[PDB]
């Protein structure tokens, strides 16, 4: 994860560059820091980057639910017994499980 990308076309003193990387990261965090405004002097720019691979494309709920349901189907245990439900769901499912399986 990245918060800010700053670009310059000159070789600006690697050591103090890393020091400023630490300083900005510490200062601009609202949990530990009280700064909001940034001034860029000397020609340094800010590249408007985006996020390439996010965690919202990985939607794995339906597949995992399907695998669990299919395993429960294979053994024969009704899903209501594992999850739990109302009385009309509780007792007939218990009878169906015991008898049929």
């Amino acid at each position: 994860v990245i918060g800010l990308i700053l670009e310059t076309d000159e070789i600006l003193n690697k050591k103090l560059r890393e020091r400023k990387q630490e300083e900005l990261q510490l200062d601009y965090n609202p949990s530990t820091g009280q700064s909001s405004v940034l001034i860029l002097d000397g020609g340094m720019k800010a590249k408007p980057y985006s996020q390439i691979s996010s965690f919202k494309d990985l939607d794995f709920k339906e597949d995992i639910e399907g695998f669990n349901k299919s395993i429960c189907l294979a053994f024969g245990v009704p899903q209501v017994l594992l999850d739990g439900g109302n009385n009309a769901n509780i007792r007939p499912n218990i009878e169906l499980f015991y008898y049929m399986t």
Binding site: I11, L12, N13, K15, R19, E22, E23, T32
Partner: protein
Amino acid sequence: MQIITAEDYRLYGGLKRPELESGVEVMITAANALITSLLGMDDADAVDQLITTKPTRKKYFLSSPSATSVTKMTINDKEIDPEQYKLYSDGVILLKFNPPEGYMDVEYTQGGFNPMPEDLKLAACMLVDHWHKQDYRQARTIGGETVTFNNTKSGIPEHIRTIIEVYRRV
């Protein structure tokens, strides 16, 4: 700072003449001041600073990355023993305890470039040469000879610019 003075300016070029012209000394001193101003330094024996303190933060940065030592530190009008911090190679200050909220006052002693780098000396010499010979035009032609000067980055030429920006965060 004092980067050049007459001896180094003479050594940069070749002057056999008795003495620098009256305008040259002013340009040398002006270059001395402009370079020490551009690199972010400030000529001062001691500097007082307000570094705000939030909890769960134990790493505070001094203004000058070339701070020799901290004479006194005071958080919320309460002095703090020297054993609760130790100043590292850079201006970075590490606090062993958890600082309370409020404001924090530090008095430190600055020292910058005790051995003078030769890059800054060359940059200052070429700056004073830039001012003396009026080489702040886009082009120039005296008879047959034609000269087209370099591009400028924030006014200063490209070479002085690269030297400064190599040293421009102190």
